[PDB]
Amino acid sequence: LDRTDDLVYLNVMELVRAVLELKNELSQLPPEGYVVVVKNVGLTLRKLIGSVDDLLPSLPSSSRTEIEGTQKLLNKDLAELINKMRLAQQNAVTSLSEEAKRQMLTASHTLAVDAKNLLDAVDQAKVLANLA
Amino acid sequence: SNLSELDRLLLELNA
Amino acid sequence: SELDRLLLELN
């Protein structure tokens, strides 16, 4: 597959990196620290859902929906990460601290997967656009 | 609507 | 390829 100017593939990798960062960094981060790397992970998502929203009109109406869904689904997953982040802050100093972090990771993770799912959902979408 | 909802989540995080 | 590579790492 030709990775010339497929904006979406790059943003994806970008995002996935951002998550991974967080994954490995959080172990060594202060409470104020989280907020930023999640912001990073938040931002890369904005670039993605951005480029995808432009590619959209040039797709089979069928897939056009299938994607807008995994789009709105992606948002629900970020929000869960944000929530699970706030928990980690007001519980930074408690015996609960160790779990919320896990949940934060799980959240960032499931966000990353659903991003890949968005990818494939667009690929197949492009395939059908060609068959036309 | 997606972009909107998402942007909103961002503003929240930044504040 | 790298996306598969990175996702491999997460797992």
Side-chain angles (χ1 to χ4, degrees), chain A residues 3 6-9 11-13 15-16 18-20 22-27 29-31 33-38 40-46 48-65 67-71 73-83 85-97 99-100 102-125 127-132, chain B residues 1-2 6-7 9 12-15, chain C residues 6 10:
Chain A
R3 56 180 300 174
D6 190 2
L7 302 169
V8 177
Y9 173 83
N11 295 123
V12 152
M13 280 200 34
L15 193 148
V16 175
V19 182
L20 277 173
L22 175 150
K23 161 164 192 166
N24 304 111
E25 286 201 328
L26 290 193
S27 68
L29 262 164
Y34 305 136
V35 191
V36 176
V37 309
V38 162
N40 288 343
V41 171
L43 294 169
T44 72
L45 176 63
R46 165 195 179 84
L48 187 148
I49 303 188
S51 60
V52 175
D53 245 11
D54 304 320
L55 185 85
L56 218 50
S58 330
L59 280 178
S61 190
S62 55
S63 293
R64 182 172 321 156
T65 279
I67 277 123
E68 289 171 358
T70 62
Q71 237 180 22
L73 168 78
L74 261 188
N75 294 325
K76 299 294 227 207
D77 301 320
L78 164 67
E80 186 177 1
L81 169 57
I82 295 192
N83 287 339
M85 172 196 55
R86 292 167 144 182
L87 274 189
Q89 302 183 276
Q90 63 196 46
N91 287 252
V93 286
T94 65
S95 20
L96 292 180
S97 194
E99 173 83 38
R102 266 192 277 140
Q103 293 192 345
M104 239 183 77
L105 285 180
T106 60
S108 68
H109 180 200
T110 56
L111 160 59
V113 179
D114 284 14
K116 174 195 183 185
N117 291 4
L118 187 143
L119 190 55
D120 309 309
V122 177
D123 290 333
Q124 179 201 326
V127 172
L128 305 177
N130 224 50
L131 287 175
Chain B
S1 224
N2 292 302
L6 165 70
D7 286 337
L9 295 177
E12 168 174 356
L13 179 55
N14 289 336
Chain C
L6 296 173
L10 243 166

